[PDB]
Amino acid sequence: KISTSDPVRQYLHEIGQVPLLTLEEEVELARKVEEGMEAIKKLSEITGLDPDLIREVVRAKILGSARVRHIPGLKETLDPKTVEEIDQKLKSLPKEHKRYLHIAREGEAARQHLIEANLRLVVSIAKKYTGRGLSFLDLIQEGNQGLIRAVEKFEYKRRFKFSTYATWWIRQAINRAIADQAQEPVSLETPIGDEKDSFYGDFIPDEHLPSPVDAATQSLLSEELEKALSKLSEREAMVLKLRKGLIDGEEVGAFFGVTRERIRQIENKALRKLKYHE
Amino acid sequence: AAIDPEEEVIAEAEGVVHLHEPASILVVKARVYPFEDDVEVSTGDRVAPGDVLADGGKVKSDVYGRVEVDLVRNVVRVVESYDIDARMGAEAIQQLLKELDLEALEKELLEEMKHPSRARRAKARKRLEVVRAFLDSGNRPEWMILEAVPVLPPDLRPMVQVDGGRFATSDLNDLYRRLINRNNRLKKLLAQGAPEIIIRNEKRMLQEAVD
Amino acid sequence: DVPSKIGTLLDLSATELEQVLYFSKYIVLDPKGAILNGVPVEKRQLLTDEEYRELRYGKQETYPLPPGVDALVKDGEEVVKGQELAPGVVSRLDGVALYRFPRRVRVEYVKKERAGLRLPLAAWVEKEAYKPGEILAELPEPYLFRAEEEGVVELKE
């Protein structure tokens, strides 16, 4: 049925089942996660293997079974066959080192239990970006991306709690994706005039295919521009080169650090000599 | 051990360690399998009775379940489950379709059709139609679900400049962006670690936007 | 589409199974799902998140305690169907009681010492089968004999 309320009684059910004990469990899991982090690092040391690699082998073992397989640096490696090789390499490693495996396991599974508990927060966050130009579900999913992001960074040592730490990283994922994804272009099919049967593609003719003077012009343009750009002192050129043409619009803020007089001055004089060399 | 090295509960002269007040109480259905000497096989795995449970031979657990590892009481609980191949959404059905013998289902339906008495075999007839359809000069039913989506060319769903700073868009492109969005966020949701209900929510979104 | 092309084909509740599981998280057993429920492996059949969680997770349960009470945490080992856990804390979910998150903890230091006394000689009044709580000497009318020594009066509760 209608997925308005489905992923809500999805979320609020296991958050109903796990609304974290504000301190107790909350931190219980954070600690476990760091325990995993370091267990993993020392395991990298003992095995000569990659930290994120061990990380992912653990992850694969916990979730039961998965394709998974994406990592920084590389992108793959044989999954069902090989992962167990890594597990039995964990089985050789005596009590002393085995311990780190047991703990890392508990850690990563705690990490997931944590996110699962903290999702209703994402819900209530994304609730205040409703009519922004993204779907509520799109909003929330970006939020959850932000909360996972928060989990990977969080240092429980410094006493402040995850609720308000995560708040930020969620707001960041949301306002991040909002800029990209979200008077706009009007749809191609609308009743025009007498609202009978006309679609607004009906009414518009064709002009030109080649749309020329684009590639060739830019080709001459940027090159010559750059030629004279280079032929005068780079301070002056570059100033309103990038001030006017690599971010935004400012003369008040223009100077790195000289007089408004001097920017004004050398700007103008630079242009002058640039246009007509004597 | 607590946060600050400042006053943590350091051990005094020998003391038997009892506990009074829990915050809550767990009632998991599980088997308690202590181990004393040597190590084991860590939290999470499947068992029934497996191979090498605890101490490296002595202990082996009978009942089917999921492994936990207790570092305090050096015990392992074994909760009720095993690799229970349970799937949700289209992936599951892709599988279902791939494992189907339409020849077999044909004969099965033949019998299902004629032999049961009337008021029933109507739907077996209608079902037979589609099976025959497939096994006729027809194709294999596993393509009935998608994992590759063709994109329509662009000029058939074009983009243009009307009256100045307005543009106009074939409605199909906003749906195609909807689906690029969802599918990509899915990929990076698998990359950036994978809590189930969230990935499902995304997968559901994905279905929704293909539809 | 009217005859649900896939829902008719696959042995399906030719409508609601598919609607249900495609869009939602609902499930059907892929190949072998060995375990228990009130029937064995259900090769083709479907279920809710409740029963499914009751298979991926097992059968966990939370029982809350007002900041003060605690009956049987020491039973961090056993529990039955419908067990008393505290004053107003039942538990029908039958499994194994487990200590969650503690507060109070008892350290017993167990101080040793050594002391003297004086008995009815001929009367058997010393067994090694006696530990604490146990009998020492019985029924001599009376005792008042010489505890040879003297000093300052000191008594412990």
From Swiss-Prot, chain C:
<protein>
    <recommendedName>
        <fullName>DNA-directed RNA polymerase subunit beta'</fullName>
    </recommendedName>
</protein>
<comment type="subunit">
    <text>The RNAP catalytic core consists of 2 alpha, 1 beta, 1 beta' and 1 omega subunit. When a sigma factor is associated with the core the holoenzyme is formed, which can initiate transcription.</text>
</comment>
<comment type="similarity">
    <text>Belongs to the RNA polymerase beta' chain family.</text>
</comment>
<comment type="function">
    <text>DNA-dependent RNA polymerase catalyzes the transcription of DNA into RNA using the four ribonucleoside triphosphates as substrates.</text>
</comment>
